[PDB]
Design a protein around this ligand. Structure first.
Ligand SMILES: [Cl-]
Lengths: 379, 379, 379
């Protein structure tokens, strides 16, 4: 089978009270356990996603101009005028121009002259934000395998109890572990794609915008050139200007209002006072083949997918970091407890390597993998 | 009496060490317990409030103009000038105007001409922000009832120990549970009222402002119109323009610098090694009358106040959510553990319902309440 | 020796499972423990620091102007022009001027005239931001004293296990306790110094800037004055203008990209099922001399350094707060558990006093210290 049991160290049983157990369910891993003559337990992180996010600031990449009107005056005729100077639907430019007999204007000199046009945006991109009323983890408690119940847990209401047969009441109690600062990050949506970019950056892009109907610095796209006895220019469709600008950007698969994420959660189960069964896996001695190259993740860590070539399943996977210097730093491992359930199922490791030149080591003895990695750290 | 005891699952007692107990005190509920021949225990959340918040950005809704001065020139007399063009106490507009014999000006043509006025705001509204040095929970430990001690716990210093007679030392250890992102929300104050609005929104309101003395884009209120051989206009008192704009806004009762909130906290008591008494209430079978209609809360959840019509007190209150689809999602309940202490005391439920059309169910069997609710999610 | 053991209340031992122990390691204090015939344990907070922070917004305090070019026209010659009006490397001002025979210009009147110059900043100051990929605590587990292992723990990956001889596996599990909202605070760097200021403030300083190469509102420094038959002014080096502005600012020692902080952490050790040894120190009766005056800290608390004059070592240090009113508030103490290890080693206390006039009390009976303190709370 498929799921990983709990070690000896991560649950307590009080003479009285109950059995409190720690758990870090991760994106793509299930955790397991049982007591005597009680059926097995399976705890799995169904998925993490955010739905229905606020609209933070709508931006016009590409707009058209309508109903264009001027009024100019001769000299000694004062400033040209137009009611439209009040409506924030028109950009309008007031310049001064030259009138001669060259335009029905008796005298020489320079004549006031203003000119407007309706500004109408046609392609808008959206910057959105995520609060607690948008996050939800879906979480499986399943009791060979069978029926399973689905707890759904949130930032606002992270306590679920659950009535498991053979085991009785069980409260879950969860909190995200390894992720994103939606306090710094906006979700960006241009037509069919969603990127994910640092707020400040987002808020600083040269364009007409609107508080998530009335545009702002419309002029950024619509301009006026040399007036004659005026004409208004404009830059094109922005799709392209951007795509080149969103270049470094974490990309995301989204659908409508839902958006899915690779979630780490971290819970503690509280259930009636029970002697569970710990397991403490034997440390591995086969060697590890790299399956597929070391990728960055979008919750900030670095995934590496190994493949175990020995007769050990199951076992703890010996792993190790050094920095440029060469120093073992004893940490930097997201995937707290990375164990070979069964060969043939390559195994993931999520680690947060240090800045600069990092040396990851997987495996015991010779034939251990030694990856270089590189890190460098801006917006 | 009045207070709710602890279940069997939420405290442990180690052979050695001590007795660690979980607790979620909520706005408007007390939690209770005791051991053998030891007097009872009462833990109550005195109140949550924030005091003395930073001033983030002072905005002028309504200002007056003073000491208004111009200087214009004829043609061939160069640009008009005024020292005041340096002081950011005056808005000043430089235009060009027409001089004839119509104003003591020998020749025809257009003459430079500038004009100023002291800008003096008279009604300011304030946007404030909340950090850790502003939050405080007040919390009661009381040991029929008697004397009680008041722990006061903060974001910065959430550990209080406390010397209880009959029970000995007891450390509390607390953290907010269900609330507000003061990282996204500003406290807004216009004259006598305090609203509570999303930062970005706030920062985007068309008005003169100042970093919490020198105004900025003063012009937003003060304008100049057609100059004559100039005059400066201005929009009125803003109270009203706003009140219509703060429309969706969560309103708040405030007093001076204090501001009070409905707080959820979540602690763990650490006290010397003790066999406490759990209670695990019987699940309710009376039916529930809705007392007062389902209100939104300002910490984001949805309160519903029920009333129990059966001979059961005490008992657990069977409750249940479905989404539009119809699916039981097993969670979404803020008021972790909602129990009938005694009839006649209607009971609250705080739940965080999903987006769209939600079906809450309270009660076991027929005669269970089934509310519809609606949700939709922007700034 | 030097390190402080664990009390009776802060670790549990389950019949089965293991030994979970609470710990708040603080900047400048080590925590200690052991079981029977097992060697002693030392847990010490190596240090907290942030490295390699994003660049949030680069600001030009002081720039120079280059390659300055105009083109003006006579009347009936239309607007002056220059290709450079497109390049955001030049600030350029278009005015109107006067042409007579005073400059080779046949007729009287006012003539269009524009003028540019390359804007080149020469001193830039930087505003930076801190996310999880920048924080790291270094933490010592040492087992008279000996060899010690250094766990390094982060916001993203706060779980380290560690193989201690005599004690076996031990997982640490940590989270900052008392600190800074890098969500509100920017790290500021002008030449050789680093300050630390509230984001909004930072984002609001009058100057050319750039998203962490193209300046913005260059004009803030570079101006044009009365054109002749034009000339461009500029304010000076900003070092000084600022230093007076960064006045209230928390100052910081930094080096390159590293920046060090006084860290509080808060962990829980999880190790195989063990009867540890608690100690519960006797409450002190000597009196306390103030060693060095009560300083503010930059994680927001107030440090006070006492000195114990009695034959008690070791003992708990009786301490107590009142507000202006006079009320004992039972909390406000950061240094959860402040104990006299040995006289001659003055002792720190970190406390978060209330707003207004605060009365701290250290010591039992007469000869107890009673400090006044003052608090007041903006940006
Ligand atoms: Cl003229």
């Amino acid at each position: 089978m498929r799921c990983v049991g709990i070690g000896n160290r991560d649950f307590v049983e009080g003479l009285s009270g109950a059995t409190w157990v720690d758990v870090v369910l991760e994106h793509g891993s299930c955790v397991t356990t049982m007591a005597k003559d009680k059926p097995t337990l399976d705890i799995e992180l169904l998925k993490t996603e955010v739905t229905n996010p606020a609209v933070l600031r709508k931006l016009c990449i590409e707009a058209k101009i309508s109903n264009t009107t001027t009024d100019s005056r001769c000299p000694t005729q004062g400033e040209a005028t137009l009611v439209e100077e009040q409506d924030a639907n028109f950009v309008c430019r007031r310049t001064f121009v030259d009138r001669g007999w060259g335009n029905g204007c008796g005298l020489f000199g320079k004549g006031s002259l203003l000119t407007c046009a309706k500004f109408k945006c046609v392609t808008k991109l959206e910057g959105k934000i995520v609060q607690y009323e948008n996050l939800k983890y879906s979480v499986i408690v399943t009791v060979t395998t069978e029926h399973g119940t689905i707890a759904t847990i949130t930032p606002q209401a992270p306590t679920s109890e659950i009535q498991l047969t053979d085991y009785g009441a069980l409260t879950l109690d969860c909190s995200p572990r390894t992720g994103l600062d939606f306090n710094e990050m906006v979700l960006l949506t241009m037509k069919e794609k969603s990127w994910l970019v640092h707020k400040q950056w987002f808020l600083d892009l040269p364009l007409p915008w609107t508080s998530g109907e009335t545009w702002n610095r419309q002029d950024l796209l619509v301009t006026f050139k040399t007036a004659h006895a005026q004409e208004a220019v404009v830059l094109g469709s922005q799709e392209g200007a951007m795509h080149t600008a969103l270049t470094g950007a974490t990309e995301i698969q989204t659908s409508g209002t839902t958006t899915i994420f690779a979630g780490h959660l971290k819970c503690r189960l509280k259930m009636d006072k029970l002697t569970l069964k710990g397991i403490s896996y034997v440390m591995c001695t086969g060697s590890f083949k790299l399956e597929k190259e070391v990728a960055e993740t979008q919750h900030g860590t670095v995934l590496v997918q190994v493949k175990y070539e020995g007769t050990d399943a199951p076992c703890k996977i010996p792993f190790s970091s050094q920095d440029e210097k060469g120093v073992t730093q004893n940490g930097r491992l997201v995937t707290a407890n990375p164990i070979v359930t069964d060969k043939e199922k390559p195994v993931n490791i999520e680690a947060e390597p240090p800045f600069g030149e990092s040396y990851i080591v997987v495996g015991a003895g010779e034939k251990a993998l030694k990856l270089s990695w590189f890190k460098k750290g801006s917006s």
